[PDB]
């Protein structure tokens, strides 16, 4: 509904953007609202300076620290900056390619 409505408005206004471009724009905007919502979710853990919260993300699409080229690379911005070290030093339940590559 949003895609076709926005495409309608950009087609009557005259902007020459493809429907796929509008789909990508709405997808990015939804991703931004996803990041905001998950920032609220993480904010539900801590509410006082003495709080000590164990955040368990069971989603396989949350970006691993090591996978910096993951599609959802923005999604570590749910974590506050002040805990980003703990993001970088974290426990992974089902990690991948946990071996040692000899072409270092």
């Amino acid at each position: 509904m949003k895609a076709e409505s926005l495409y309608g408005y950009l087609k009557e206004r005259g902007y020459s953007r493809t429907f796929e471009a509008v789909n990508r724009n709405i997808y990015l905007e939804n991703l931004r609202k996803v990041i905001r919502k998950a920032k609220q979710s993480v904010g539900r853990g801590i509410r006082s300076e003495n709080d000590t919260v164990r955040i368990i993300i069971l989603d396989p699409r949350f970006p691993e620290p090591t996978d910096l080229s993951s599609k959802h690379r923005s999604l570590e911005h749910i974590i506050p900056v002040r805990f980003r070290r703990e993001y970088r030093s974290c426990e992974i339940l089902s990690p991948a390619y946990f071996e040692e590559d000899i072409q270092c």
């Binding site: 090591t66 910096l68 690379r73 070290r85 030093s89 590559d101 072409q103 270092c104």
Partner: protein, 235 residues
């Protein structure tokens, strides 16, 4: 003049990186970026302002800014690409609208693009295409982040012309140990020979820009260095 912490900066490599023999140091990138931010081709002022955002080793004469180290992932690794500049003599470039070619019998003397001073230059340059570029440095994180994100600086050679080594997604993460100059005796940057750090002997200036000033004997690391992205993010 500012407090300086050991930071490691990792950026997603968008373009192949042409290495000009010596590995591109982060201080040179920051010197280009400050040469833009405060418009200045005079080395002294840019160096002075770089010292305000980057730590400078007085006993060595070098900036606390390690050379380029490619961060290779298990999916993508260091690759051998060719940064290729080709002259494109378009039909509009070879037209009388732009210039008056020498004329004989009403015929316009064609440009000898095969050879000569008016040839189609095909400049191929070795470039290394790894998924990530990582540097280690001791300095102000906010300033270096601002420069690397909102200045026209790349890594390698001719980024201002060939757009080689374009990077994005600059991530700065704090380090526990200063790995910008030295690491277990292995030089991580162009250092003078008298420093006692072992590496590859070469001829270069220590402080940027690395193409001016007397080129003295230095010890610099392997031009192409690779580390696993996991090991780089371990810190």
């Amino acid at each position: 003049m500012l407090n300086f912490k050991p930071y490691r900066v990792i950026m997603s490599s968008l373009t192949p990186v042409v290495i000009s023999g010596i590995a591109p140091s982060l201080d040179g990138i920051l010197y280009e970026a400050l040469s833009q931010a405060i418009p200045s081709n005079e080395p002294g002022v840019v160096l002075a302002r770089l010292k305000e955002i980057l730590l400078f080793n007085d006993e060595l004469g070098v900036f606390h800014a390690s050379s380029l180290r490619f961060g290779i992932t298990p999916e993508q690794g260091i690759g051998a690409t060719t940064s290729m500049r080709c002259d494109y003599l378009s039909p509009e470039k070879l037209s009388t609208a732009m210039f008056s070619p020498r004329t004989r019998r009403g015929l316009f003397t064609r440009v000898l693009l095969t050879g000569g001073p008016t040839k189609r230059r095909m400049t191929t340059r070795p470039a290394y295409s790894a998924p990530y570029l990582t540097f280690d440095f001791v300095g102000s994180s906010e300033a270096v982040e601002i420069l690397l994100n909102h200045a026209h600086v790349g890594v390698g050679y001719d980024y201002f012309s060939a757009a080689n080594g374009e990077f994005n997604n600059v991530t700065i993460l704090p380090l526990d140990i200063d790995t910008s100059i030295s690491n277990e005796g292995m030089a991580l940057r162009p250092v003078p020979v008298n420093s006692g750090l072992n590496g590859i002997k070469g001829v270069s200036p220590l402080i940027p820009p690395y193409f001016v000033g007397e080129k003295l004997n230095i010890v610099h690391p392997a031009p192409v260095r690779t580390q696993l992205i996991s090991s780089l993010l371990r810190g």
